[PDB]
């Protein structure tokens, strides 16, 4: 092992699953369940066959309010979903017993499609998932109905939208959790451009599962961006374990102790006491009636303070059942803990800074919006390196219906399809099980 640390792993009910697991058995570079989640999200597409059929019938293709009078085509696509999906699957698969999956949902109105992993191992990136899915469905619908050469371009418009006159698939009736590679704010950012509402939809609003999916995506991007290489690797791994995986049951036990009557400030007091009890921090200096704390392990102090930050969000936005104050919790949990202790806040101020701008861009005229439309690639919330966005996904899981741009509003097609996939819906389970399986290989 490069690192000596071990952590105890729990389920989403606070029970112990596996004790003394080497930290690197949770690394995205080693854990086979993180590999399967990331390859799964690269290759999964949701197809809205109802939506394609309605766009054709009305000639409403190419984006909001667009219509071409005289181009209408009335095709019984949902009535023939089974044959269309099988014909699509035969073009999508590479061989007949590979890992291609095409599965109808909703009586044939939707299809879950997982493009074979093989097409990816010989691809630069991930756009083969929507592009191979879209052409196989376009060609299967043309072949089902014998649509003529003169009319077939309307099926293409109904499936993939105004692309390539627009850069995005504007008006498409397919959806993915990833977005196009041209929208990345920097190279290595693609696993960050996944809307918070899509992670909350996929996990069915289970708070701990949404926080774990979001943390796995954020911290895996930190490896792809090179942030978790060399000096910083251990900080990133401990963040993943303690803030996203409930390592040592720290998040769970803080929420249990502060859930009935607690505030952000009471969670802070508990976390400082636990860090002192575990030897992570110690009193360095006495000033006048004020203890200055120090640490000989900055990555572990940062991890413990990250688990407290997640607990504080769950307690504060859980008590209001309203997600908007996560921007304030992310600010003041960190601002309070530095003046409480004399030690630097989570991500050395970068959570606090992200929360300053996120609060502005979720309570002002200038842009942004509600918490659910942000993501690790959004200009306002890219700055902390994985320690902010998972808390926004916990907050949105806990929202009881205060948002206009809620996951029901923005992510209904992603919910129906992507929550079918067990490792997307319940990732904490599978990543724990895999870490136990490889514990003696580290």
């Amino acid at each position: 092992a490069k690192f000596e640390d071990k952590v105890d792993l729990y389920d989403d009910r606070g029970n112990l699953v596996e004790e003394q697991v080497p930290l690197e058995a949770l690394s995205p570079l080693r854990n086979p369940a993180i590999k399967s989640i990331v390859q799964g999200i690269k290759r999964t597409v949701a197809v809205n066959l109802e939506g394609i059929e309605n766009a054709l019938k009305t000639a409403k293709v190419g984006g909001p309010a667009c219509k071409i009078m005289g181009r209408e085509l009335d095709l019984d696509i949902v009535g023939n979903a089974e044959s269309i999906a099988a014909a699509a699957k035969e073009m999508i698969q590479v061989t007949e017993d590979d890992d291609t999956n095409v599965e109808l949902l909703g009586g044939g109105k939707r299809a879950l499609v997982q493009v074979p992993s093989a097409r990816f191992d010989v691809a630069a990136e991930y756009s083969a998932a929507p592009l191979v899915t879209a052409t196989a469905f376009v060609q299967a619908i043309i072949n089902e109905f014998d649509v003529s050469m003169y009319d077939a371009n309307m099926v293409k418009a109904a499936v993939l939208g105004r692309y390539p006159q627009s850069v995005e698939y504007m008006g498409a009736n397919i959806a993915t959790m990833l977005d196009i590679p041209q929208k990345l704010e920097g190279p290595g950012y693609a696993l960050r451009n996944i809307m918070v509402n899509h992670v909350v939809a996929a996990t069915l609003k289970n708070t701990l599962q949404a926080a774990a999916l979001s943390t796995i995506l954020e911290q895996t991007a930190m490896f792809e961006m090179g942030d978790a290489v060399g000096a910083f690797e251990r900080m990133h791994l401990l963040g993943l374990a303690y803030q996203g995986m409930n390592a040592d049951n720290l998040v769970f036990d803080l929420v249990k102790a502060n859930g009935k009557e607690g505030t952000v400030g009471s969670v802070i007091a508990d976390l400082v006491e636990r860090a002192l009890e575990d030897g992570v921090i110690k009193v360095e200096k006495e000033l006048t009636d004020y203890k200055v704390y120090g640490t000989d392990d900055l990555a572990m102090w940062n991890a413990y303070a990250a688990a407290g930050l997640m607990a504080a969000t769950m307690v504060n936005q859980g008590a209001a059942r309203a997600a908007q104050g996560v921007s304030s919790t992310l600010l003041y949990y960190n601002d309070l803990i530095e003046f409480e202790t004399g030690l630097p806040s989570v991500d050395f101020g970068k959570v606090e800074g992200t929360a300053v701008g996120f609060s502005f861009f979720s309570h002002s005229i200038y842009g942004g919006g509600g918490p659910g439309i942000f993501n690790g690639n959004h200009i306002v919330t890219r700055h902390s390196k994985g320690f902010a966005i998972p808390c926004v996904a916990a907050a949105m899981a806990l929202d009881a219906g205060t948002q206009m741009f809620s996951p029901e509003a923005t992510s209904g097609l992603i919910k129906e399809v992507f929550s079918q996939v067990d490792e997307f819906r319940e990732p904490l389970k599978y990543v724990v099980e895999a870490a136990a399986e490889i514990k003696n290989e580290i």
């Binding site: 219509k67 309570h363 919006g369």
Partner: protein
């Protein structure tokens, strides 16, 4: 009767247009021209003032060894030298583009829902008129909440404002008419019916930011400026905290969830934000031009008014400046809106189709493309062979390829009622013209022409799209002059022959039905002539804040 281009040819040259021979070299070069003489004298005064040589007729080769022609702006009796149709010298062309660049359409539907659900407050025609008075103060750059704000000079921004439209006559009739684009007043009855059905009970703002700001800045500024001042006027008008969490849902609706840009952003090699010409699809350009609601009994006039709009914007300003620059591409575009030449050819094709098939009654298939696009291509080419003065006028092959194929493609779409077979007609015209004269356009003219037949009906990722959804960023079309404005005319053609109120987006069509625009979108060619004559008054100038 005389072909439609005869009067313009008779004004250009002393010979009858049929005559084969002329004499050159005796007109004194640049000295034959009023405008070139203006330019020589101005270059000498510029060079002396600034201490650096500038325009000099003795640099490079000597213009005017042949007649420097006047051009008739088609549908007008205005004749001007072509320099007066260069976009730099024509304030009507610059204002046409400013009026598109500075406009965005922004729904009030999501915003009214945030007010009713999140705030628990009512929305009525009364709270809407109060909001419109507020946003008409705020939008040009004036304050509604804070103390000690400093503001734009109202007269510098007199062209900025906010109107609304809705398919619900009872709301639209109750708001002050000063703020309403009235669909029943602006559109003939059957088109008004169609447009109000598409809008239904939705209520949409048409926001125009100031031309001086659009010119200082860029097209991607428009929807941000619009959303700032909708956001201020929603705070003031509906008594929100001036900056609470619900304020962010009005921002997101105004910038993302209920906005229609005129153009979408472009890829990095030609990087540009929204509301730049390359992002405007051909179907939106056809719906921006307002000829369809005035000239609906004449589908040729509606289609060719769209060709004028798009040739000027896409070839002269967009490809001739944004994507190149210099002297640029004036006459690649003037070919398509001067001397009544495309008009003659397109009126021939319309009559051919109305007599053979009836408009929109021909089968929508390749047999109709082969018949109509070949008949009209041979008609147009025969005019250049029969009238030597017509060939000397449209002297570049690319000009003739675009005009002949526009007439062939529009006429094919007037037969089928479908723009995709009109596009196949356009490519077939190119292949026939290249074989007939053993030339077509410039070195690079038929990149999209040779990919063209195979990509008209393709369904693949970056190939397949109905012509209404294509635009200057469709891959094959991204580079070259002499195509984009003509494709906007082919997109308009089947819909003008059908009597459709719009080509691709009903909200765009209604958004330009407005006499408070600076440019008159009902009469694009008339406006071009006014600007060529130095008679058009643009917005945006700084005269009020600079010395006399």
């Amino acid at each position: 009767a005389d072909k439609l281009f005869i009067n313009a040819l008779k004004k250009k040259f002393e010979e009858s247009p049929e005559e084969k021979k002329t004499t050159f070299y005796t007109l004194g070069g640049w000295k034959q021209s009023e405008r070139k003489t203006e330019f020589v004298n101005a270059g000498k005064e510029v060079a002396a003032k600034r201490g650096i040589p500038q325009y000099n007729p003795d640099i490079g080769t000597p213009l005017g060894q042949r007649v420097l022609m006047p051009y008739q702006v088609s549908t007008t009796d205005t004749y001007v030298e072509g320099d007066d149709l260069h976009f730099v010298n024509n304030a009507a062309m610059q204002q046409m583009w400013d009026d598109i660049r500075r406009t965005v359409i922004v729904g009030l539907n999501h915003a009214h829902a945030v007010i009713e659900k999140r705030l628990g407050k009512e929305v009525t025609p009364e709270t809407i008129t109060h909001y419109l008075e507020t946003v008409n103060h705020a939008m040009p750059g004036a304050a509604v909440v804070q103390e000690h704000m400093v503001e734009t000079h109202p007269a510098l921004v007199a062209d900025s404002y906010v109107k609304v439209f809705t398919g619900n006559d009872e709301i639209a009739d109750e708001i002050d008419p000063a703020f309403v684009i009235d669909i029943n007043k602006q559109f003939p009855e059957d088109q008004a019916e169609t447009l109000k059905a598409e809008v239904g009970d939705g209520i949409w703002q048409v926001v125009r930011i100031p031309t001086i700001v659009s010119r200082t800045c860029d097209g991607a500024t428009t929807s941000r400026w619009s959303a700032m001042q909708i956001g201020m006027s929603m705070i003031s008008a509906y008594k929100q905290a001036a900056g609470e969490a619900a304020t962010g849902d009005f921002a997101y609706a105004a910038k993302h969830a209920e906005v229609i840009h005129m153009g979408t952003y472009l890829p990095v090699r030609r990087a540009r934000g929204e509301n730049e010409p390359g992002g405007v699809p051909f179907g939106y350009l056809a719906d921006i031009c307002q000829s369809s609601r005035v000239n609906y009994e004449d589908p040729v006039r509606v289609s060719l008014d769209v060709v004028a709009t798009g040739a000027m914007l896409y070839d002269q300003i967009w490809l001739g400046s944004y994507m190149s620059g210099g002297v640029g591409f004036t006459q690649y575009a003037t070919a398509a809106y001067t001397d009544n030449i495309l008009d003659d050819f397109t009126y021939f094709g319309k009559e051919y189709v109305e007599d053979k098939y009836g408009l929109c009654e021909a089968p929508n298939n390749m047999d109709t493309v082969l018949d109509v696009a070949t008949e009209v291509t041979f008609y147009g080419l025969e005019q250049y062979e029969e009238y030597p003065a017509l060939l000397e006028d449209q002297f570049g092959g690319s000009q003739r390829a675009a005009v002949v194929a526009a007439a062939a493609g529009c006429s094919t779409a007037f037969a089928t009622g479908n723009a995709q077979t009109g596009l196949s007609g356009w490519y077939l015209s190119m292949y026939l013209h290249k074989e007939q004269h053993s030339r077509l356009g410039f070195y690079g003219y038929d990149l999209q022409d040779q990919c063209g037949a195979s990509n008209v009906f393709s369904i693949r990722g970056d190939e397949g799209l109905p012509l209404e959804l294509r635009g200057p960023n469709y891959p094959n079309y991204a580079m070259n002059v002499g195509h984009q404005g003509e494709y906007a005319g082919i997109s308009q053609a089947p819909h003008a022959a059908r009597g459709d109120a719009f080509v691709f987006n009903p909200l765009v069509k209604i958004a330009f039905a407005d006499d408070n625009l600076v440019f008159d979108f009902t009469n694009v060619r008339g406006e071009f002539a006014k600007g060529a004559l130095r008679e058009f008054e643009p917005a945006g100038e700084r005269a009020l804040i600079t010395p006399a």
